């Protein structure tokens, strides 16, 4: 859900460094997700602002 919203890239980038304990192992949220999966999530979060908002895409492309 956060990958599909404006400002979600900042949220995900901050939360990737926080800790979580699951199945008896304490990891970070970036380690719980894969490294390539985290990179794909980051790309999606960064690029989704220009797909769900035509105003931003038009503004940047015209500039």
């Amino acid at each position: 859900d956060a990958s599909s919203r404006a400002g979600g890239a900042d949220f995900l980038m901050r939360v990737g460094d926080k800790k979580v304990t699951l199945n008896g192992a304490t990891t970070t949220y970036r380690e719980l997700i894969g490294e390539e999966q985290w990179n794909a999530l980051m790309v999606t979060a960064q690029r989704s602002q220009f797909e769900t908002d035509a105003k931003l895409n038009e503004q940047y492309r015209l500039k």
């Binding site: 220009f50 797909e51 769900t52 908002d53 035509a54 105003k55 895409n57 038009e58 492309r61 015209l62």
Partner: protein, 62 residues
């Protein structure tokens, strides 16, 4: 869109494209990018290029 791109004056083409965008807003009433808004963004970029080529000729004649 193609007829708006075949005008001699770029300033008229820009306003024609604005009118076409207003027409499209009534059938796509949301904010996401569709393949039809890409048409209009590309058309506006082409009109900017046409404005460059037009200012060439105006400056040369002056």
């Amino acid at each position: 869109i193609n007829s708006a791109l075949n005008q001699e004056d770029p300033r008229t083409a820009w306003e024609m494209l604005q009118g076409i965008k207003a027409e499209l807003d009534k059938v796509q009433p949301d904010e996401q990018m569709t393949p039809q808004r890409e048409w209009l963004i590309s058309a506006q970029e082409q009109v900017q290029n046409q404005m460059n080529a037009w200012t060439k000729a105006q400056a040369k004649a002056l």
